[PDB]
XYZ file of C-alpha atoms in Angstrom:
207
model
C -1.542 -22.529 -18.248
C -3.259 -19.330 -18.318
C -5.578 -18.862 -21.239
C -7.263 -15.904 -22.855
C -9.613 -17.786 -25.031
C -11.367 -21.132 -24.617
C -13.970 -22.236 -26.949
C -16.316 -19.264 -27.393
C -15.302 -17.687 -23.979
C -13.010 -14.664 -23.642
C -11.294 -13.293 -20.795
C -13.030 -9.973 -19.591
C -16.468 -11.105 -20.880
C -19.395 -10.408 -18.613
C -20.894 -13.778 -17.300
C -23.102 -15.517 -14.720
C -21.495 -17.436 -11.950
C -22.738 -20.074 -9.346
C -22.090 -18.710 -5.796
C -22.205 -21.157 -2.850
C -25.786 -20.090 -2.133
C -26.689 -22.016 -5.287
C -27.957 -18.896 -6.806
C -26.416 -17.299 -9.945
C -25.070 -13.916 -10.247
C -23.396 -11.442 -12.392
C -19.614 -11.063 -12.915
C -16.569 -10.810 -15.093
C -14.406 -13.753 -16.336
C -10.792 -12.543 -15.233
C -8.981 -15.575 -15.845
C -8.961 -19.152 -17.446
C -6.730 -21.719 -15.994
C -5.799 -25.215 -17.178
C -4.502 -28.197 -15.140
C -3.690 -30.747 -17.616
C -6.979 -31.841 -19.198
C -9.056 -29.815 -16.570
C -10.154 -26.029 -17.009
C -11.398 -23.547 -14.522
C -12.829 -20.132 -14.827
C -11.916 -17.279 -12.340
C -15.043 -15.110 -11.951
C -15.025 -11.613 -9.972
C -18.559 -11.232 -8.998
C -20.096 -7.576 -9.003
C -20.876 -7.359 -5.277
C -19.204 -10.169 -3.541
C -15.755 -11.780 -4.242
C -13.979 -13.956 -6.578
C -14.453 -17.619 -7.247
C -12.711 -20.195 -9.110
C -15.415 -22.249 -10.883
C -15.731 -25.235 -13.279
C -17.299 -24.577 -16.741
C -20.602 -26.259 -15.672
C -20.772 -23.367 -12.886
C -20.742 -20.450 -15.289
C -23.469 -19.291 -17.693
C -23.739 -16.892 -20.610
C -25.591 -13.594 -19.806
C -27.722 -13.961 -22.845
C -30.964 -15.852 -23.649
C -30.299 -18.732 -26.207
C -32.028 -19.127 -29.494
C -34.537 -21.862 -29.478
C -32.738 -24.085 -31.722
C -30.018 -24.400 -29.278
C -32.188 -25.772 -26.453
C -33.202 -29.375 -26.256
C -34.740 -31.579 -23.710
C -31.859 -32.050 -21.294
C -30.083 -28.774 -21.831
C -28.467 -27.494 -18.715
C -29.626 -23.908 -17.947
C -30.044 -21.165 -15.350
C -33.579 -19.781 -15.067
C -35.761 -17.235 -13.134
C -36.934 -19.178 -9.889
C -39.876 -17.778 -7.982
C -37.710 -12.933 -4.283
C -36.656 -13.690 -7.852
C -33.392 -15.608 -7.996
C -31.405 -17.371 -11.025
C -31.246 -21.091 -10.148
C -29.943 -24.101 -12.313
C -32.082 -26.638 -14.064
C -32.753 -28.791 -16.936
C -34.939 -28.223 -20.004
C -37.659 -30.726 -19.785
C -40.086 -29.328 -22.599
C -39.462 -26.931 -25.334
C -42.285 -24.682 -27.018
C -45.108 -26.717 -28.266
C -48.972 -26.085 -28.816
C -49.810 -28.192 -25.692
C -47.626 -26.224 -23.338
C -48.532 -22.771 -24.901
C -45.167 -22.334 -26.344
C -43.129 -22.186 -23.078
C -40.256 -24.089 -21.907
C -40.608 -26.548 -18.848
C -37.693 -26.366 -16.450
C -36.772 -28.784 -13.841
C -34.638 -27.227 -11.279
C -32.028 -28.803 -9.303
C -33.912 -28.714 -6.045
C -36.978 -30.763 -7.600
C -39.083 -27.637 -8.350
C -40.792 -27.303 -11.770
C -41.985 -24.400 -13.571
C -42.821 -23.016 -17.158
C -40.607 -20.110 -18.275
C -40.192 -18.194 -21.323
C -37.050 -17.762 -23.631
C -36.132 -14.344 -21.706
C -36.021 -16.190 -18.395
C -33.280 -18.545 -19.462
C -29.583 -18.496 -19.653
C -27.288 -21.447 -21.112
C -24.632 -23.134 -18.967
C -21.203 -22.423 -20.631
C -19.536 -25.879 -20.541
C -22.363 -28.302 -19.490
C -21.373 -31.912 -18.714
C -21.791 -34.555 -21.355
C -24.367 -36.174 -19.131
C -26.080 -32.788 -18.244
C -27.796 -34.153 -15.224
C -24.557 -35.487 -13.461
C -23.950 -32.015 -11.683
C -27.438 -32.233 -9.884
C -26.388 -32.644 -6.132
C -29.436 -34.582 -4.969
C -29.163 -38.210 -6.029
C -32.806 -38.803 -6.213
C -33.441 -35.735 -8.468
C -30.440 -36.661 -10.481
C -31.522 -40.113 -11.196
C -35.143 -38.902 -12.140
C -33.802 -36.472 -14.337
C -31.596 -38.973 -16.175
C -34.597 -41.307 -16.658
C -36.632 -38.644 -17.845
C -34.128 -37.021 -20.299
C -33.053 -40.481 -21.882
C -36.624 -41.904 -22.068
C -37.928 -38.724 -23.762
C -40.236 -38.487 -25.672
C -41.763 -41.428 -23.749
C -43.272 -39.833 -20.619
C -45.516 -41.661 -18.346
C -47.862 -39.178 -16.718
C -51.116 -39.430 -14.811
C -53.997 -37.618 -16.270
C -55.596 -35.483 -13.605
C -58.481 -33.203 -13.546
C -59.389 -30.198 -11.048
C -61.282 -31.565 -8.152
C -59.735 -34.972 -8.281
C -58.626 -36.265 -4.841
C -55.216 -38.017 -4.636
C -52.591 -38.618 -2.204
C -49.457 -36.514 -2.643
C -46.173 -36.986 -0.929
C -44.393 -34.387 1.338
C -41.511 -34.993 3.795
C -41.479 -38.690 3.186
C -45.172 -39.265 3.786
C -48.458 -39.151 1.827
C -51.033 -36.488 2.352
C -54.661 -36.063 1.451
C -54.727 -33.590 -1.390
C -56.873 -32.116 -4.179
C -55.994 -31.178 -7.972
C -56.719 -27.398 -7.909
C -55.366 -26.557 -11.357
C -53.784 -28.179 -14.458
C -51.354 -26.395 -16.779
C -49.761 -28.505 -19.431
C -47.589 -31.092 -17.772
C -47.926 -29.494 -14.318
C -50.650 -29.789 -11.715
C -51.390 -27.499 -8.901
C -52.027 -29.774 -5.757
C -53.712 -28.219 -2.815
C -52.774 -30.092 0.499
C -55.857 -30.346 2.243
C -54.747 -30.242 5.920
C -52.029 -27.570 5.329
C -54.348 -25.545 3.022
C -51.373 -24.598 0.865
C -50.620 -25.368 -2.952
C -47.727 -26.876 -4.877
C -46.936 -27.092 -8.512
C -45.709 -30.560 -9.248
C -44.835 -32.339 -12.501
C -47.817 -34.940 -13.576
C -45.248 -37.655 -14.100
C -43.701 -37.046 -10.617
C -43.483 -40.076 -8.135
C -44.759 -37.846 -5.523
C -48.425 -38.065 -7.034
C -49.564 -41.464 -5.638
C -51.133 -42.532 -8.856
C -47.671 -42.362 -10.401
C -46.161 -44.112 -7.337
């Protein structure tokens, strides 16, 4: 069946859709199609083309109120070239994170963002992490979200020497900076930095 309405979605609304690049882009919802119990959403993007997308691959083009965001909420967020990329809410605003949202992006990256940097996915899966492609990231997120608020983390201080994983091996590294539940690691040989979640198994003390 072709529908005009489905939940709070309405044909002709402006929306965000996930392109094959895995980045998300502005478009118009031009059809809603059902095949038995399944639903698909046809989006005409502003620049490039039409896609027929599942409901977990479209997002509303507004910022959600804080009371609709939980740990485990499926979102699209500003990713640092600024793109929109999918992720999971790991923390909501509190004193210890200076009232920011912590996002775990689908590729394993973590960042603090503000409400104005977030968009809600329209039809998230019941287990929101189940559409994370990478099995290792998917399993990590499942454990994190379901164990929350029980969060094993390593206490780290600037100047501390540790081993950090990159491309499957351990590297000598130094803590450069700490920000909430994130640590900025300097890889000593490569002399570049990366922000990493303090409960990541990439930090040798967590492994």
